Structures are given as C-alpha cells and as structure tokens.
Design a protein around this ligand. Structure first.
Ligand SMILES: COC(=O)[C@@H](NC(=O)c1nn(Cc2ccc(F)cc2)c2ccccc12)C(C)(C)C
Lengths: 266, 218, 232, 338, 57
C-alpha cells in the first residue's frame, strides 16, 4: 500500500528521478573490461564481480522504474502481473547478494586454502555457480506462482530474510576470517603485520558498506513480523530503500576500481 | 551428424586426450616451480644438496608441498633468449656466497647478476628468496680480511653485526621494483634443514599474495 | 603384439560363458576392441565393440541384449559375457584391436580366436563370387558391391579388405580404400569408388590363398561381405 | 699483422663490401614497382586449437598440410588434426623445456628439443599404438633452438652453443658440424631441395650452409640485433630473416646481399617467427607485440594483419599446400588462419 | 694462441669473396617471375571460394 508524505507529496516523487542519476557512469564502465579484455581481466573472480556488475544494473533500472510507478501515479498496480515487477526487484537484490556471496566464497578459499585455490576455482566452475545465483534468484522470486508493503505475503517476506540475512552472515564470517588468518599469517613471518593493513583497509570497508545497505532495510522489513506495522514507520522506509541504490554505486567501485587490479588497465 | 563411424571414434580419442591433458596439468599445478640462480661457485651446488646438462630439476616434498627447483647454471648461453622460458615460477632462489666479498670482484659480480634478473621485464611479479651462503666462512674471513674492500663506501663496524646486514641492504637496494616484488633474504644456516623451512614459509607468502592479487582483494 | 583369448568350448543351450582375450605387446588402453564371430564354414560377423576408455559400446542386432562386452585396462583383458547361448552363437570368436585417429588402420590385428560350440537398415556387402581358381604368378581381381555408397562426404570411403588364410586369423590387407596395411606386399592394390570395389592382386603367390572378405566401416553394425575364396 | 687479422681479413671484408655494391645496380623496390598491390588481406581465424596449458613455443606442419605438431612448455607435444580440430597424439616429454619441434616430411617421425640440450625423435607409426622415443640426439652444449628433418634418417639441429649439426638418426651421431657463428644459432631453414640451409644467430648474421660439404658458403649481415627467425623463399633463391630490431629483410642468395627491408615505425618489437606463403608473394611475420603482420614480399607494404592473439606470437607456419597459416602464441592457443 | 682462429676466419672470407654474384636486377626480376607465375596456386593471396578450402567449417 503506497503511502507518501502529503506535506511534500511532490517533493518525494520528484526525488525519484534525482536519485537515478548515477549507476550509469560507473557500473556501465565496469562491464566494459570485457571490451578491454586481454588485459587480462577475465578470471573466475572477475565475472563474479561481473555478475553483480550487471545485477546492480538490472535492479538499478527495475527499482527506479518502481519509484516512477510507486503504486499511485504511473499504472498503479494489478494483482497478478504487478508481482513480476516485484520479480525484478528480487531478481536483482538477490542476484546482488548472489554475486556478492560467491565473490566472498572464492576470496575465502583463496586465503584459507591458498595452495588449493587454482585447483578449486577454475573456468568450469564459477560459471556453474555463476548461473545458479541467477537461477535461484528467480526461483526464490515467485511464491504465488506455486500482505503489508506492496501486496505480498508476510510468511514469505521472512523467507527472503531467511536467504539474504543468511548470505550476509557467510559474507561477514568470510571477510572477518580473512583478516584473522591474514593476521595469524602476517605476524608469524615477522615472528620469524605488513599485509593486514593493506588488507584491513579494504575488507572492513566492504562490511561497513554492507551493513549500511542490508542493516536498516532488513531491520524495518523484519519489523513487520516482529511488531505491528504502522503507517508512521514506512514514511521513510520509502526513503530508507534509497540505500539499495546507494550500494549500486559502491559495489562496482569497491570490488573493482579502488582495488588496484582495475587501476592498471586504465 | 556428418561424422562417420571413424570420425566419431577419432573424436572420442580426442576427448580422451583432452582429459589426460587437463588432468596432467592439474597434477603439475600442485607443484611450486623455483628458478635457482646466482654466480655459481660454492653456494648453488650445496643448497640443492642442502635440501635433497642444460636443466637440472630437483624435487623435494616439504610439508605436503611438492617443490620443483630448476637449476640453470649449466646452460651457458645468452641468458636473454631462454630466460623467458621461466616466466611464471613462484620464486627465484638466488643463491649468493658471503665468502666472495674478498675474491672482491666476485661479490660485486653477483650484485651485477642479481640486478639483471631482479629487473627483467619477465620477472616483475616474481619474488626472490635470496640466500646468503656460508655465513660461517663469513665469520672468520672478516676476522682477518675486513669489509670495505668490496664496498668502499662502507662506513661501519666489522663485527658481523652491520657487516652481514650491509650485504643484505645492498642486494635489496638493487630491487628497482619495490612494489611488485618482495625479496625474502635469509642467512643460510647449513646446520639445520630450516633452509627448506624458509623456502616453504616464503613460498606460502608468495602464493597467498598472488591469490589475493588474483581475486583482486588487494 | 598378441591377442590370446580363451574360454568357451562346448556349452548346453541357454547357458553362459565368459570369453576373455588377454592382450599383450601394445598399449591396450589406447585401442578399441571388437569381437568378430565366424560361424563354422561361414563368413565373418561383427559381434560387439568397446572403445578405448569404455565410453562406447555397440552390438550386433543378434546379440543386443545377450552379450556384454567389457574390458579390464589394468589387467589388459577384454571380456565377452554371454547369456542364454543359442545354437546360432556357435563360432570361433576373434578379438580384434582397432585404433581410430586420422590416418590410423583399424582392424589391423586379430586374435587367434577361441572356439565355442553350443550344444543342440544395414549396409549389405555383396561379393557373390566364390572359389575363383588361379595359379601363382597370375593377376587376380576381386569385387564386392555395397548396398549403399560407402563414400562418406569427407572423402573417405570406408571399405576394408581382409584375408583369412586357411587355419589363420584374418589379416588386414587394405583399409579405407587403396591404403595398403603395413606389412602387406605391395602387389595388393585396392580400387573402387562409391558402391563397386575391387581388390587387385598384381601377381598371385602361394601364400595369397584363402578367403577374402570386405568390410564396411561406415556405420554400425559392421558388415562383412561373404567369403570370396581363392583356391589354386 | 695487426693481431694477425686486419692485414687482409679486415680489408677482405671490404672486397666483399665493394663487390656487393658493384652488383647492386637497382634495388628490388625500384624494379618491382608499378605493379599492382595485393590488396588488403582479411584472413579470418578458421580454427582455434585448444588444449595446451602452457605457452606454445614451437609449431610445424606436416607435409600433408593437415596435421601439425606443436610443443608447449608443459611437457606435452600435441599432434593436431587441423581440419577437424582433433588431437591425434599427445606426447609426454621427459624435459618440459621445449623450444622447438619438427614434423618429418614422411609424417612418420616428430622431433623435439629445448633447454635439455637434446633433440628427441619420436616414432609415430609404432606397432604398439603409442608414441615411443625412437632416439635422443645428444651432443650440443647449448639449448636446441630449432630442428628440421631432411628425411627419416637425417635431421639438422641448431643450438645455443653457436653451432648447427647434421645428424644420423639411426645412430646417434652428428655426421657434420657447422661452426661459423659467433653467437647463439636461433633458427635454421632448409632450402626446398634440402641441399642448402640458412641459419640465423644472435650475432646479427645469417649463414648459408651446404649440407654435404659442411661449409659456410655465404654470410649475410644487415641487422642490428639478433635474428630470431629465418625462412627460405619458396624458390630457394632468397630468404627472409626477422630480428629483435623489429625488421624483416629479404636476402638474395645469388646476388649475395640484402634485397629489401620490411619495417614500420609503429613497430618496435622483435620478430619471433617469419614465413612465406606459397609463391612467396606474402611475407608473414610473427611479432612480439601480439600481432602477425602480412608483408607484400615484392613490394614492402604491410598488406594485412592477423591480430587475433592475446600474447606474443611465438611461431607461425604456412601449410605446405598454401591453404592456411598456423600461428602459435604464448597464450596456449594455435589459431589456423585462412 | 689465437692465430689459428684468425687463420681460419680469413680462410672463410677467402671463400666468401670469390662467389660469382649476379646483379640485383637479374635476381629481383627473377623473383617477380616466381611470384607472378605462381600467384594462381596460393590460396592466401588470391582467396579461393568456400567450396575449395578445407577450413570452411
Ligand atoms: C514489489 O513492490 C515493490 O515495488 C518493492 N520493490 C523492491 O524492489 C523491493 N522488494 N523488497 C522486498 C521483497 C519482498 C518479497 C520479494 F519476493 C522480493 C523482494 C525490498 C526490500 C528493500 C528494498 C526494496 C525492496 C518496493 C515497495 C519496496 C519498492
């Protein structure tokens, strides 16, 4: 049920276009490394970032297209076809967490089992597990094919929390571990920490960015079943979902550019 | 299908050669390859014996890690033509004799070879596990024959404290790529087999820093 | 190089035997292995086929469900499991090694054969001649017509000529066409194009005597022409 | 005698330098001018032979123009079917440091060598069905940089010890030894008659040899750096040599001097391989900068490019019936152009 | 010491100076006569139809 601030009802629908400005100059430049291929830039951990490179582009348009829709102004809704626009919002927000998860599942076996990294992550895999993040991003996208905010169930609204919240615990244990084992390792060599600061100022930023992304929204979105949903809580939940496009700019820039791998191609 | 009965058995032969190549490469990816260099008088011949004509491979499995060590001392050709063959070794064990500062044009020639491979275009990402051999012979060579003969600008002690560590700074200063290469110096003990331990601990650091660089996590 | 297969003998109908051919003297893993049956005083008949690596197995329609070809690469043995042996399965079962790549020579070596006396759509290779009498030093010609053009679109015509001397196992003489098998005297020559094929012997000798079969190796099953005997 | 050489040897090399100027009345690029160019040559990658895992350093076609062997730095030697990109054989090498391979003109043998200082001869038509090492030809003191069969029993190798050597393969003994070069011999090339072969060394000179006499019959020097590649013109009366200084040159055996020079200012990289097409009108050159230019041989204009590699083109070869061009590179892919 | 080595370099340059050399005009025009008499039978200079090459697909 669309609910908007009547005091500045114009001031909110007008912000819909202002927010959609970026995620065009950056994430569009991030997938052209396939055009700057033979750098070389195409190894198994660069099309995982390529996955979120596009899934951050799908939900970049699928989501902005909803805040031009917004349930009230532009072709308000239906009871059957509207959910396949919901199917876009979960197709991307779960493809992101699918891409963001796999990229932390090879960075884990990269430093956990460093010798057996090339024997695990390869060309055959990372396209199999690649598409499976794009496939169950859809099979987790249609419950009614097989009741508070948009129109959708409250027992399924927590199941998606059962996915996204669980994939954000294995992306935190992965990166925290990678500063642990990096710290046990890098101290032992001086024991016989020079890497744990070149690596701490890039792994704690991934978790700071991640927490501001899926922390508030998943919090308010789980207030429904852990509370009584009021009209006064989702006055800024419409605004609080801005951060879902906020990480739309940081994912292609943190996982690709400010890490110096992409900075030699340019 | 347009494949005859023999054109299909020839493709079954081809796909069975494909797996033996894919498999035989996985079996040779478990092995860390190490170029072995250095002006070879006394050190290179003992470190491969410390661990157990054109190329000389040497296997040694230390702690569930199979090492291959390629000694190229007996090649004697223009090194610039076959050196790119070794592009892609984990590390370059560069054996050096501390007992050649007074033999002084030999220690100063090993620094001329270290600067040649440490600054190739083919080895910009390859670290160097630099060994400094015979620090026992460097004990009593300084006892009579001081330093400053091979290093005139050396203004320091002679008691092996800044004596040896002034060698270790001269080589590591020859590194012209401090960012994309890390020298891992070690003073070879020769009374213990921790030399393979230093190689093992310096290779697990090269591999990890490659893995982290492969996944772009730096 | 030798293929020595034993097993079989006499068997009461409906029973079961286990023929085994113990290869020795070559890279048994690299070779596909046929079985080729020869009924008493009759022609050759393809039975089974297991490729190298065991990733392929073909059978004749007669033995599609009763025979089970299988190979033990570490042991260098080829096996044929027979179930419900009929009287029409009485024959000498040859084990044939065939290796397939560009330029190879399939069917180049035949085991000596193990006898098995049981108690009691397809290319048709037609060489309706039989008992062509000749004396040594003469020039002989043998032909066998195919029910279909054995010329495949890739240029290879898949006709093989075999020679079974009396008491021996067959010998490869000419693979695909006009390709003389290694170890064969060059007086043999193979000619043909399409569906009419000819084995020309320039000057016949005292050892060039026996039944000459032709085989199509274009598609399975593999069909041998009936025997063309040369008695002097 | 001025350390016993400059008395005549330094002036004798001016008799030669004055004879080679007397016979240069007009250059190739003057008399072979006002003839039609070959037009831009778009060769498309017709095949991509995948399966090597390391860098491919050597490649050589069979005389049937269909099969080709290739040697990569993993200890594997693959014999490819180029029409249907199948693998006929994959030959495991004792030494992984292969720098050259060659296919016998009879198709029965293949040779291989590198940093191990040995040229291994492999028998392909064995009765056992696998590929055995029919012979190991040892005796060079430097890496083998190029080998070439004369027939099933004669192979001329060339080595980093400044020496080429003819070999008898039945025995293991080199029956001739060619000792003119003062630098590493990097590449040799048999004349189409197999009675003469040229070799190029890192001393910037190419020497014409006589396989029977064993004598350096002629010597060519135009380059400023190492000659990585050398190939006879299909006539047998000229050859082209590509060097580290990014220049190919066409040398003339009967005129005994350099006919042309194939350079371009955008090009600064060494030349890894070189080869003529049938009729010798196109000079293909495999450059260090990932490319393979296509030089009009009679003119000097680069009449095309083969830019399909992601790494140094380490070896190319034109099939002996002229149909196609195979190029290997340090990215582990053979591309068959056409 | 090395007089025998400089004694053989001259023994080579003595041989590499008495070759009979035809001028470049008779040997450049003799290369055009090959590249122009064989331009028909090379599939890479005069690209043949897709019917004749073995690599068409
Ligand atoms: C479908 O109506 C929409 O347009 C929602 N769009 C989303 O893109 C969106 N959907 N969910 C939760 C979700 C629940 C069930 C499901 F099957 C898939 C997703 C979000 C959560 C936080 C921020 C944005 C969204 C909106 C009302 C939040 C704008």
């Amino acid at each position: 049920f669309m609910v908007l601030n009547p005091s500045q009802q114009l001031a909110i629908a007008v912000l819909s276009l202002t927010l959609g400005t970026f995620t065009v100059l950056e994430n569009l430049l991030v997938l052209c490394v396939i055009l700057h291929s033979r750098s070389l830039r195409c190894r198994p951990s660069y099309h995982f970032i390529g996955s979120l490179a596009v899934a951050d582009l799908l939900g970049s348009v699928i989501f902005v297209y909803s805040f031009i829709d917004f349930h009230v102004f532009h072709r308000k809704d239906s009871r059957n076809v509207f959910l396949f626009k919901l199917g876009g919002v979960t197709a991307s927000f779960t493809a992101s967490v699918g891409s963001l998860f796999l990229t932390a599942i090879d960075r884990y076996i990269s430093i956990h089992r460093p010798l057996a990294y090339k024997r695990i992550v390869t060309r055959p895999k990372a396209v199999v597990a690649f598409c499976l993040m794009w496939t169950i991003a859809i099979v987790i996208a249609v419950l009614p094919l097989l009741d508070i905010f948009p129109h959708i169930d409250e027992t399924y609204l927590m199941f998606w929390i059962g996915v996204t919240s669980v994939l954000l615990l294995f992306i935190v244990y992965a990166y925290m571990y990678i500063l642990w084992k990096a710290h046990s390792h890098a101290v032992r060599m001086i024991q016989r920490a020079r890497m744990d600061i070149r690596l701490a100022k890039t792994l704690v930023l991934i978790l700071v960015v991640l927490i501001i992304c899926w922390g508030p929204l998943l919090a308010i979105m789980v207030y429904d079943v852990f509370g009584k949903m009021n009209k006064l809580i989702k006055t800024v939940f419409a605004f609080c979902s801005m951060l879902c496009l906020l990480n739309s700019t940081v994912n292609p820039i943190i996982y690709a550019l400010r890490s110096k791998d992409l900075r030699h191609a340019f | 299908c347009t494949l005859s009965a023999e054109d299909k058995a020839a493709v079954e032969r081809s796909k069975m050669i494909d797996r033996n190549l894919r498999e035989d490469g996985e079996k040779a990816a478990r092995e860390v390859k190490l170029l072995l260099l250095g002006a070879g008088e006394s050190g290179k011949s003992t470190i491969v014996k410390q661990m157990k004509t054109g190329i000389v491979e040497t296997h040694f499995t230390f702690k569930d890690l199979h090492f291959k060590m390629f000694d190229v001392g007996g090649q004697r050709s223009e090194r610039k033509k076959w050196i790119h063959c070794f592009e892609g070794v984990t590390a370059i064990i560069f054996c050096v004799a501390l007992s050649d500062y007074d033999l002084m044009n030999r220690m100063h020639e090993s620094m001329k070879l270290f600067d040649s491979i440490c600054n190739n275009k083919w080895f910009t990402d390859t670290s160097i596990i630099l060994f400094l051999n015979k620090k026992d012979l460097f004990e009593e060579k300084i006892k009579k024959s001081p330093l400053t003969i091979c290093y005139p600008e050396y203004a320091g002690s002679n008691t092996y404290e800044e004596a040896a560590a002034y060698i270790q700074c001269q080589f590591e200063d020859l590194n012209k790529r401090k960012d994309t290469k890390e020298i891992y110096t070690h003073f070879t003990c020769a009374t213990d087999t921790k030399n393979v331990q230093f190689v093992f601990d310096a290779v697990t650091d090269v591999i990890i820093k490659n893995n982290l660089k492969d996944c772009g996590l730096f | 190089v030798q293929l020595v297969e034993s097993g079989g003998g006499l068997v009461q109908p409906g029973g079961s035997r286990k023929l085994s051919c113990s290869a020795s003297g070559f890279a048994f893993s690299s070779f596909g292995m046929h079985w080729v049956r020869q009924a008493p005083e009759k022609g050759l008949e393809w039975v089974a086929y297991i490729s190298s690596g065991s990733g392929t197995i073909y059978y004749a329609d007669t033995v599609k469900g009763r025979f089970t070809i299988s190979r033990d690469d570490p042991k260098n043995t080829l096996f044929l499991q027979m179930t419900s042996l009929r009287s029409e399965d009485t024959a000498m079962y040859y084990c044939v090694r065939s290796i397939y790549y560009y330029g190879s020579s399939p069917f180049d070596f035949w085991g000596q054969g193990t006898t098995l006396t049981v108690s009691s759509s397809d290319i048709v290779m037609t060489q309706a001649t039989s008992s062509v009498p000749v004396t040594p030093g003469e020039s002989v010609s043998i032909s066998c017509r195919s029910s279909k053009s054995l010329l495949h679109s890739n240029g290879n015509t898949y006709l093989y000529w075999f020679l079974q001397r009396p008491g021996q196992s067959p010998q490869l003489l000419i693979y695909r066409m006009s390709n003389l098998a290694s170890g064969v005297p060059d007086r043999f020559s193979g000619s043909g194009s399409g569906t009419a094929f000819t084995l020309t012997i320039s000057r016949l000798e005292a050892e060039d005597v026996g039944v000459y079969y032709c085989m199509q190796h274009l598609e399975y099953p593999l069909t041998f022409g009936a025997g063309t005997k040369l008695e002097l | 005698e001025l350390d016993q050489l400059r008395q005549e040897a330094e002036q004798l090399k001016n008799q030669i330098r004055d004879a080679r100027k007397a016979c240069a009345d007009a250059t190739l690029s003057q008399i072979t001018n006002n003839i039609d160019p070959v037009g831009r040559i778009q060769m498309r990658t017709r095949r991509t032979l995948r399966g090597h895992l390391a860098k491919i350093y050597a490649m050589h076609w069979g005389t049937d123009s269909r099969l080709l062997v290739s040697a990569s730095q993993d200890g594997k030697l693959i014999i490819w079917d180029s029409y249907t990109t199948n693998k006929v054989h994959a030959i495991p090498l004792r030494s992984s440091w292969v720098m050259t391979c060659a296919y016998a003109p009879s198709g029965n043998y293949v040779a291989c060598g590198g940093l191990d200082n040995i040229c291994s001869i492999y028998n392909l038509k064995t009765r056992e069905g696998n590929v055995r090492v029919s012979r190991e030809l040892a005796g060079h003191t430097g890496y083998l940089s190029c080998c070439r069969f004369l027939d099933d029993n004669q192979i001329v190798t060339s080595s980093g010890d400044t020496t080429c050597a003819l070999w008898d393969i039945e025995t293991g003994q080199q029956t001739t030894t060619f000792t003119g070069h003062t630098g590493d011999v990097m590449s040799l090339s048999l004349a189409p008659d197999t009675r003469l072969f040229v070799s190029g060394a890192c001393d910037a000179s190419a020497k014409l040899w006589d396989v029977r006499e064993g004598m350096c019959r002629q010597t060519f020097t135009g380059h400023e750096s190492d000659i990585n590649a050398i190939c006879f013109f299909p006539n047998g009366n000229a050859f082209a040599t590509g060097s580290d200084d990014a220049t190919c040159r066409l040398f003339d055996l009967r005129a005994d001097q350099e006919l042309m020079t194939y350079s371009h200012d955008n090009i600064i990289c060494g030349i890894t391989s070189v080869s003529f097409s049938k009729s010798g009108r196109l000079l293909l050159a495999g450059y260090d900068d990932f490319n393979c230019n296509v030089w009009d041989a009679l003119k000097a204009d680069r009449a095309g490019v083969l830019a399909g590699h992601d790494n140094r083109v380490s070896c190319l070869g034109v099939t002996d019936d002229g149909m196609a061009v195979a190029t290997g590179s340090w990215d582990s892919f053979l591309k068959i152009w056409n | 010491a090395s007089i025998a080595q400089a004694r053989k370099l001259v023994e080579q340059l003595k041989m590499e100076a008495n070759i009979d050399r035809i001028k470049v005009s008779k040997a450049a025009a003799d290369l055009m006569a090959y590249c122009e008499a064989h331009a028909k039978e090379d599939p890479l200079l005069t690209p043949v139809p897709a019917s004749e090459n073995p690599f068409r697909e």
